[PDB]
Amino acid sequence: GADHVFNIFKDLPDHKILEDKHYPAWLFTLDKPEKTYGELAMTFLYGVGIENATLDEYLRFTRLHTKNLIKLNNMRLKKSKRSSVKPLFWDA
Amino acid sequence: PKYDLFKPLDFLACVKSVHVAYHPGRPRSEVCRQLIHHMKSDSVRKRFPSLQASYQLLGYNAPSTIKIELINGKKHEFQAEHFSLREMQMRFDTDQFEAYLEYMKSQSVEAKP
Amino acid sequence: ILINAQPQGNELLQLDVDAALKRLHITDALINCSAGRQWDEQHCWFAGHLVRS
Amino acid sequence: PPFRFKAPQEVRIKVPIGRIPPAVGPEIRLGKSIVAVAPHRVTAEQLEDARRVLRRVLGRSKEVHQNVHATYAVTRKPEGTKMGQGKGSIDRFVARVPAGRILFHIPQINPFHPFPEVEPNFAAFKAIAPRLPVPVVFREQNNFFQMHSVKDLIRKRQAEERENREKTARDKLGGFHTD
Amino acid sequence: KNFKTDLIRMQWPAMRDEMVRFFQSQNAIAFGVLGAGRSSAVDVACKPWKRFVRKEDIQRAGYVPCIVEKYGIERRLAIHRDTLEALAFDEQHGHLSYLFQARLFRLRIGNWIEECIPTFVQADPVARRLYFVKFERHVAGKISEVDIPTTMVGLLACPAYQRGYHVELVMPTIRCQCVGAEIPPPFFVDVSRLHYSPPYTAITLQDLQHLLPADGSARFHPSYDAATQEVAWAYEVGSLPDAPLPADYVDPNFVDRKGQKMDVCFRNHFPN
Amino acid sequence: GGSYGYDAFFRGAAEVLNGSNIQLPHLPENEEQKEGKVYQLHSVRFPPQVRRLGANYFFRRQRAVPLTYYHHLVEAGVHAQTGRGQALCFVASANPGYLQSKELENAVFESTRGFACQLILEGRGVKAYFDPEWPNLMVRLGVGVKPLALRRLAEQYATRAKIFVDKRGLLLTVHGYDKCAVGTLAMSLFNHLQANPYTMKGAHVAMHPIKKKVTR
Amino acid sequence: SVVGRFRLIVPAATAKPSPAIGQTLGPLGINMMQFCKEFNARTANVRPEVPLQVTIVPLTDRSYKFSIRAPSNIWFLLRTARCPMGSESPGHQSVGNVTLKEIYHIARCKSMDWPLIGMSLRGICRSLIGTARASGIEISKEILPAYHKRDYTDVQALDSMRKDMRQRKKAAKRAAT
Amino acid sequence: MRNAIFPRIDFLRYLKKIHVSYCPTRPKTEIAKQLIMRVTSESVKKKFPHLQASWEMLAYDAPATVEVELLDGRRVRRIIDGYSKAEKKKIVDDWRFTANMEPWPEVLGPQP
RNA sequence: AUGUUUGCUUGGAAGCUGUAGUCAUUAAAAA
RNA sequence: CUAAAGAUAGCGUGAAAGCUCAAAAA
RNA sequence: UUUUUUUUUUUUUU
């Protein structure tokens, strides 16, 4: 009946599992932990590994830097007692 | 407290229609682009929904032109290459304020579409 | 071109005569006024104190 | 390894009222620190209240340490004693805190190195400075050097880019020779 | 599909080169930023100390008196306040820096150059001022005991800190025996790899021993123990064991004007 | 004068250096405007009305940098205007701030169109009718309450400003030539035409409504 | 002109005037009799009383329009992991576990939605991953040793009664304290 | 950026030459038009003085073409015939207001 | 802007009565 | 037009809606 | 800057 997991329509079969060779390559790569802002900063601000830098790392660092800037501004402009700020942020 | 009675009028306020015609790459062509972007802004769309804006790109070297028609039937034509946004408004500010005065008298400014 | 090739600032001698004109009840004097021919659309000179009356 | 050293014990001995000696030299402590500017007496109750306020403001995740302990005893004349009938009984305990001595400090190091545009945090010390009977001043010393600064590099790069741009603009017009 | 992506991918190699070149250029000065092969010496001028001149006079004039004393005759100099204090206090919210006493000052007086290192400093406790700074000569081949500071800039990259654990810097400075012509730069504690453990976690000097000069000019104090001399800790707040008071503790509330212990401290009934 | 205060003497005025960098009203000013700024001479063409200002405002008034001024006077379908064949005034300066003073725009608006304001009326039974003719203004403040004679204000401000009321009598428009006068008049009116926060029967300046309240 | 935007959660293929939909449709003054019919007519090809579809009703000054979409991410994730509830204090306690292949299918399924048109499948996948993370559901290549069974014996038909039993049990066990 | 050394990504930073051609009578030219207008702007001129831009208007029915010359010397050619963001939003809204749920092929899982 | 009214308390909890977590958007006619 | 936009800093409501700020562009 | 001014305000930044 309604025991399906990949089906919402009426009178249709459920999605079956296939072999790994059928799925996209990229599908089996998401398990890895992505680099953190701390790690990425060492390569661009300091130049630890700039000789082996990549466009994806540059894009991730550019996004994470603006994230930090906005979180900084909000930290300072915060007034309320509501628990919404990471303890690390407070150490600034 | 401090109340703000007088407020400057927007460039696109009490305007019936606007037309732009310029040549990309021509010297002194920033006015046209700024006007275009202003016209096709979000704020404008919300504040003056009944506005008819249009732009044209000329395929030959010719001077820039801007045509503005107000709601009271007044018409004006200026050259983008010899004027600015600020300066243009001062030329037809009188008719704009006349129309806004009549509208103010006739109706409230707090109305919504 | 017309504005970057002309004197800039104040002028003591001009101000003295302006004060004298104001004292003499002269409200028709124009400071830094241009002039030209009838069929002229651009003026290349600006008189110090011009009076039309 | 880290340890939780036990605090000293009050001395139940009558002592003179002699003056407060000056400090030997400046005391350097990593991280945030709060120090006095003038000499004065501080009571154990005052110090305990300051500690409680600091802990409440900071929270249970952060750590704090005390640098001054109340051990100097002081006597007071009991109500109902004549002009002079000997020294009075011990009244309370105070700590001789000279100028420049540190009271509280947080070894915590600012992690935000590439963000010199933001001043440190001193809300906890502000919440207790009015309480203290002495004027206090905030302090925060780190291992950060000038040589190791990114500001200089940013400045340098901006200058370089400006120069490059200028050069390009001059060369484009062809008003001067090249090379 | 869009062309901007293609263009950006095509142009990325070129863009990389510019950053590479910029870092190279930066590095060129020595003839990474955090490298051990970086000089830290400073060069400043001085003025002679005139006869029949007091300390106070010089101080008031806007100068800091100083003297130079080892491996040569005693020399007297004066260093500008605005020049000296700037080096001394290299922080916006800090006091006398550790690095101040870990440099190679190339003082210039008349027609002579002296390569010295400050040892003795007389600074105001509260205010940022310098009263008297002594100097010591440094001659190649002679053992010189110098306190090299440590840095922990790379704190953001700490898994322990990320997880919300507390991190501390035990040793601010490490003792070394300089023999060479130049003092090694500040040490860098690479905390990028520091995992939290139930009992505790710590870092020793054995890991940092690789940062010393290859020529062997510098060497840590033999007294230290690289296998057990920790420099940094990582523990949980409010989970530490209890320990007794150290035997070498002196109560600062029972100190005489002369810098001596009170008579009371010698009494039987004197706990702690 | 010559007396040290206790705070500055003993304490040394340490309070000023005991403030926190958090819970701020406004963000800190960015320190971006550093060394490397290049100044340029800006120029603006204003209508010929600014001539009424005279020399006392352009030359006599002291300023950090020079403030030149010139008057280009020219002898006299679709309004096809160009940069030639018309009069104007050139105002040039090195500081852009001097080219944005409100007095320059007032000199033109006062003698060209002037200023105006509006007041909105709300409440059940609130009507603003007219007497036989001007100057005689009466406004009814609810049902059963006597009207308000507003002739004093109009007589005071005669020839300086005028009051208009729509057919419905729900809008009080004010038109004048004097900014100060206009404003004063408007606020004068609103002082006695102010609305009650509970019953909501009165008047209010546009774009500034009053919040309602309820009893506990 | 428009007044705003409103969100609703009404069953697909099976709708009726109830306080749930009324809480949103009352203040607006929208006739539920008409609305119900209109809605029903547009979801004939969906299972009855099983799905939790999400609808948005942008209200017009006079008129009104609305659109329908698929359920939430958590709706899918919990059913795939065979778990009645989430995880208290995420990041410390683990409850469920879903493989990458199921995530893929989820992403594919969810691809059909106006807010997602033009977005990469990879993005959807990573979003799902993040959502899972935010709930306390571990993700790995294959089933981990600690969750070999993965509660497969438990049928998904009794999810509502399992949720109600947990809701009452958690309050009952703590009330006596 | 505020606290950064290098700028953000920009495809106009490492380009020598740029040329765009389109026909007014052909549909789906808005993209080209906007490209032209942005390319031929003063701000771009000021930011990248080293860029040579030139647009053309075709009098014959052909797709909108783009030819760029890199700094290095490499050359590429592309065609731009598509909708804009506003047109895509309008098209999406037109279908969204219909609200007709059907078993689209996309929904279905993969298979060889 | 969007997944997303993400989760657990709660009769109910949207970014904004408590608390935990606090990353996801630009990518498959790249080989 | 391009670019950028904190799981959300300050208002608001009855559960909602709505506005503003940061960031980005100019 | 305007008799605007019992705790209410406008204009211009001098």
Side-chain angles (χ1 to χ4, degrees), chain D residues 80-153:
Chain D
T81 316
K82 73 184 199 184
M83 195 68 176
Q85 205 135 244
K87 195 154 190 163
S89 60
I90 300 151
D91 177 34
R92 81 207 95 84
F93 300 100
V94 282
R96 311 202 296 175
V97 192
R101 182 65 62 248
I102 307 176
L103 298 162
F104 298 131
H105 63 280
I106 318 155
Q108 187 65 58
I109 304 154
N110 189 1
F112 299 10
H113 178 238
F115 300 90
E117 314 199 338
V118 68
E119 291 198 358
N121 163 57
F122 298 123
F125 305 145
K126 192 184 177 187
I128 50 160
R131 314 277 88 220
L132 306 171
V134 292
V136 302
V137 63
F138 308 146
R139 279 195 179 171
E140 183 173 276
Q141 180 160 11
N142 318 280
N143 298 350
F144 311 145
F145 314 121
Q146 300 167 2
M147 61 189 172
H148 301 152
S149 180
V150 188
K151 199 176 180 180
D152 309 75
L153 294 160

Side-chain angles (χ1 to χ4, degrees), chain A residues 37 41 45-46 65 68-69 72 75-76 87-92, chain D residues 32 62 108 110-115 117-121 150 153:
Chain A
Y37 172 71
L45 304 180
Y46 307 116
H65 183 248
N68 290 6
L69 288 167
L72 282 156
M75 190 238 60
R76 290 177 289 168
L88 75 96
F89 281 103
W90 298 112
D91 296 342
Chain D
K32 296 169 186 161
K62 308 300 185 183
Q108 187 65 58
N110 189 1
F112 299 10
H113 178 238
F115 300 90
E117 314 199 338
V118 68
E119 291 198 358
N121 163 57
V150 188
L153 294 160

Side-chain angles (χ1 to χ4, degrees), chain A:
Chain A
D3 294 326
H4 306 160
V5 287
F6 316 123
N7 214 325
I8 199 159
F9 289 103
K10 196 81 185 301
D11 300 350
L12 288 172
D14 206 353
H15 303 167
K16 198 168 183 175
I17 311 306
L18 306 174
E19 197 159 34
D20 296 30
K21 77 200 186 205
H22 291 174
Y23 297 95
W26 60 267
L27 185 58
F28 308 128
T29 60
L30 312 172
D31 194 37
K32 310 189 294 183
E34 303 202 71
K35 286 186 177 176
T36 61
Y37 172 71
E39 298 156 275
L40 289 165
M42 293 176 162
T43 306
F44 299 114
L45 304 180
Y46 307 116
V48 177
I50 196 75
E51 65 185 352
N52 300 312
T54 61
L55 185 67
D56 179 41
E57 291 185 350
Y58 192 57
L59 286 158
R60 188 171 170 77
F61 168 71
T62 45
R63 183 59 141 67
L64 292 166
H65 183 248
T66 319
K67 266 200 174 190
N68 290 6
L69 288 167
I70 292 159
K71 281 187 176 181
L72 282 156
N73 290 359
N74 286 4
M75 190 238 60
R76 290 177 289 168
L77 290 172
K78 185 172 173 67
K79 286 185 175 180
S80 65
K81 294 194 171 186
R82 182 167 60 86
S83 307
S84 71
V85 196
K86 215 155 178 184
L88 75 96
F89 281 103
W90 298 112
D91 296 342

Side-chain angles (χ1 to χ4, degrees), chain D residues 48-106:
Chain D
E48 198 71 25
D49 193 64
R51 189 186 68 78
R52 291 190 300 217
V53 185
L54 288 168
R55 290 285 291 170
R56 182 165 176 162
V57 180
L58 291 167
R60 299 185 179 179
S61 58
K62 308 300 185 183
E63 179 166 290
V64 294
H65 293 283
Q66 186 172 348
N67 200 58
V68 282
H69 324 322
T71 51
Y72 207 86
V74 54
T75 68
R76 191 189 206 87
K77 281 284 186 172
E79 191 178 296
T81 316
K82 73 184 199 184
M83 195 68 176
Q85 205 135 244
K87 195 154 190 163
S89 60
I90 300 151
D91 177 34
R92 81 207 95 84
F93 300 100
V94 282
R96 311 202 296 175
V97 192
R101 182 65 62 248
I102 307 176
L103 298 162
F104 298 131
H105 63 280
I106 318 155

Side-chain angles (χ1 to χ4, degrees), chain G residues 4-122:
Chain G
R5 306 154 294 160
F6 317 92
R7 313 170 296 285
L8 312 87
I9 319 171
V10 188
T14 323
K16 285 185 182 180
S18 50
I21 191 174
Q23 271 181 356
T24 47
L25 303 183
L28 315 175
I30 304 153
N31 52 348
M32 300 196 282
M33 279 186 170
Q34 188 173 344
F35 183 78
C36 196
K37 295 164 186 181
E38 199 162 48
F39 172 81
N40 291 333
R42 284 172 167 189
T43 55
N45 313 316
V46 184
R47 214 155 206 293
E49 314 188 52
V50 299
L52 285 65
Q53 288 205 327
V54 182
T55 73
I56 187 168
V57 176
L59 186 54
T60 320
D61 73 336
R62 195 60 273 172
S63 315
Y64 75 99
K65 292 190 177 185
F66 70 98
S67 69
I68 308 168
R69 57 169 179 170
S72 180
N73 295 0
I74 199 80
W75 189 89
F76 290 95
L77 288 166
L78 290 166
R79 289 183 89 267
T80 312
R82 301 186 180 272
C83 300
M85 283 187 169
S87 196
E88 188 177 330
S89 197
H92 313 122
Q93 180 170 321
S94 181
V95 167
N97 171 226
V98 188
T99 65
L100 304 153
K101 294 173 179 173
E102 300 163 285
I103 301 153
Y104 188 84
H105 290 180
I106 304 153
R108 282 207 71 155
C109 184
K110 281 279 275 173
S111 64
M112 273 289 166
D113 207 1
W114 80 80
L116 308 165
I117 282 164
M119 291 198 190
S120 194
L121 200 65
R122 191 171 167 283

Side-chain angles (χ1 to χ4, degrees), chain D residues 8-12 44 70-71 93, chain E residues 271-272:
Chain D
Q9 294 159 103
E10 298 97 322
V11 181
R12 296 277 174 174
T71 51
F93 300 100
Chain E
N272 312 134

